[PDB]
Amino acid sequence: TEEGKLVIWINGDKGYNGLAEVGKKFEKDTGIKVTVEHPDKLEEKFPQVAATGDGPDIIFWAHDRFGGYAQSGLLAEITPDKAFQDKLYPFTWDAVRYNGKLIAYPIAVEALSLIYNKDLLPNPPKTWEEIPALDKELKAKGKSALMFNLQEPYFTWPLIAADGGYAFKYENGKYDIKDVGVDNAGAKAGLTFLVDLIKNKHMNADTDYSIAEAAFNKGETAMTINGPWAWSNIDTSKVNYGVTVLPTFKGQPSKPFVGVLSAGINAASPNKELAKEFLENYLLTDEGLEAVNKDKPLGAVALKSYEEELAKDPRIAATMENAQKGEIMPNIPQMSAFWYAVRTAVINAASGRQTVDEALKDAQTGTQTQVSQRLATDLLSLMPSLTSGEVAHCAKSFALLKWLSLPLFEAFAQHVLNRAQDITLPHLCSVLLAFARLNFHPDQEDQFFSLVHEKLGSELPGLEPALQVDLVWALCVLQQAREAELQAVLHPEFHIQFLGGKSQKDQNTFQKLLHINATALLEYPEYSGPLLPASAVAKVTPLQKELQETLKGLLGSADKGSLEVATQYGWVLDAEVLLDSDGEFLPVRDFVAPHLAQPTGSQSPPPGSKRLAFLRWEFPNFNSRSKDLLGRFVLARRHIVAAGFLIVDVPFYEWLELKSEWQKGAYLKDKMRKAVAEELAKLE
Ligand SMILES: OC[C@H]1O[C@](O)(CO)[C@@H](O)[C@@H]1O
Ligand SMILES: OC[C@H]1O[C@](O)(CO)[C@@H](O)[C@@H]1O
């Protein structure tokens, strides 16, 4: 930012001294002094001081940061002619583009490769499909085939994306933030193969960077996946290692992300043509790059002529080959959500918290919709200027993603109260329905639901019938329904309406009617209003499957428990048992069962009998990243308890820690005992 000289920022781990030698030759020929600095955290200092017109004339950094600098207008558009652009590998120019315009010069290229132990594995595998058999071979020799960091998506992405996956679609020099390839058939096939490697004991789901590096550099595993930064540590080991092309999957190359060390020009620089001359004519030449490479190695470089020299090192050649088959890392701000969404998906799928399809689906959603704490924070700040309809829209969308940001939902409630004067019923109802879906109770709880009752009392009968059900049901979820609202939906007219339907929509409306009716029966003791007539109350997951098989083994006989028990309240129990006072199973269906629509037995349960319900909770039954159930299932559990059941909760994350059948039986028996003991303590 000073005329007549050039100031260059570059990270401290690069060959800034070799870069200075280029500056000295530049001064010698042009008379322009060139100064090179390596300030700490320059990738964060640069947007600070360039926003106000200060900083260096040229900055060196990985290309992904430059996309954000350009958005702020901090990087000048560069003007290399086609003659110069032909000197560099074409794909590298695709990394220094913003809104179709070049904003930096490619310098060096970096990507993951396959690193292998030539003593354990003289010829590395060409394909991913061979590795399992190879691991069986090596496990018998006291070794393993492959170990790499499974915790961070940067290392797993080469396999996930091999057969068609991609972060954001790139076309005509631009990224399409709406076109996300996290959940297509290629991403699924790759992740499935990764998960299968784990299930088959060829890889461990806990393996991270440190574990894999130690294993390979100690000679314990025949292969790893890593980058040039890791070569020094292997040189200091005793492993005769090679570096080569990543294996194919479905005959498609592995697609690692590519990092392009680039040089940008400060938009606030008065020496843009001097910076252009130094970069194009002195740095990006065989002599210039050699000078920098002599100080600290660049790895593979974008300049074709010098890459031919460096590529004599077969490790550099493999780096460039993998980069040319890889996916340039998108330089757009939308990648932040990608990293978080995909990281969660891989961990969830590899550990069994989700299937491959479920995990990638959510990562897709998370990447397309850019959900992040910054999103909720941005909305929280707009709240005073948002309309009632915009809040209703917000609430609906967050509830749909099961994303319960307590600070934002409390601001929804306050927003509604501050506009109780003119807020329309639809806008109020959208918030109510969102609160119920996520089981959110605001701090000004009495005030919020007083408004709901007030606004809804006079207009409820005139609403569409299915909507009346949706709204009363939401109040039942939140324990706010009033007898007059229950009555409005439970009087003998409303039923015949939805009762006789095949739509699956009337059937859902009716199911919610059973929940309302169940609330009146079980949670309002003084309720003397109308109820549904007794005559009108009459796909399998792995968790559901294993829970049933484990329970069948414990019970021993079919008569000591009932599986998939449909109640007259709409809810279905995974299982029910009747324990006598000694904790031994009784023949449950020999006894009366008020919770059921049909009577199934005449005998009265012995005194001291304890009726237990096993209730399974699946991953989607919870708010995102929490152990709090959605409203629908808070309501279900509240009803089963009110029906006189002791609860054995079987959430997926508890069952997931039980790796053997013995553990699963022991866990269920413990939960039964604990529930019964919890009760006896209640009665004191
Ligand atoms: O290539 C640069 C990238 O490499 C990583 O270390 C991989 O974990 C990232 O943290 C960084 O952004
Ligand atoms: O979200 C709260 C709910 O979470 C559970 O622990 C899940 O098993 C229930 O016991 C509890 O009521």
Helix-strand blueprint:
Elements lengths: L5 E4 L6 H15 L3 E4 L4 H9 L7 E5 H9 L10 H4 L4 H4 L3 E2 L2 E2 L2 E6 L2 E5 L13 H10 L3 E3 L6 H8 L5 E6 L2 E8 L3 H15 L9 H9 L3 E6 L4 H5 L5 E4 L3 E2 L2 E2 L3 E9 L6 H12 L2 H10 L4 E2 L2 H7 L3 H12 L1 E2 L6 H17 L4 H14 L3 H10 L5 H13 L5 H13 L6 H14 L6 H15 L5 H13 L5 H8 L2 H7 L5 H19 L18 H14 L6 E5 L5 E8 L5 E2 L23 E8 L13 H12 L3 E6 H5 L4 H22 L2
Bound molecules: beta-D-fructofuranose (FRU) (2 copies).
Describe this structure in words.
There is one protein chain. With 684 residues, the protein is an alpha+beta fold. It has five domains: 6-110 and 258-328, Periplasmic binding protein-like II (D-Maltodextrin-Binding Protein, domain 2, 3-Layer(aba) Sandwich), CATH 3.40.190.10; 113-255, 3-Layer(aba) Sandwich (D-Maltodextrin-Binding Protein, domain 2); 371-453, no CATH class; 463-536, no CATH class; 542-682. Helix content is 48%, strand content 15%. The chain has 29 helices and 22 strands. The strands form six sheets. Strands 1, 2, 3, 6, 15, 16 and 17 form a seven-stranded mixed sheet that branches. Strands 18, 19, 20, 21 and 22 form a five-stranded mixed sheet that branches. The protein has a four-stranded mixed sheet with strand order 8-11-7-12. Helix 1 (16-30) packs antiparallel against helix 12. The longest helix is centred in the C-terminal third of the chain and has 22 residues, at 661-682. The chain is flat, with a radius of gyration of 32 Å. The structure holds beta-D-fructofuranose (2 copies). One beta-D-fructofuranose binds at residues 110, 152, 154, 259.
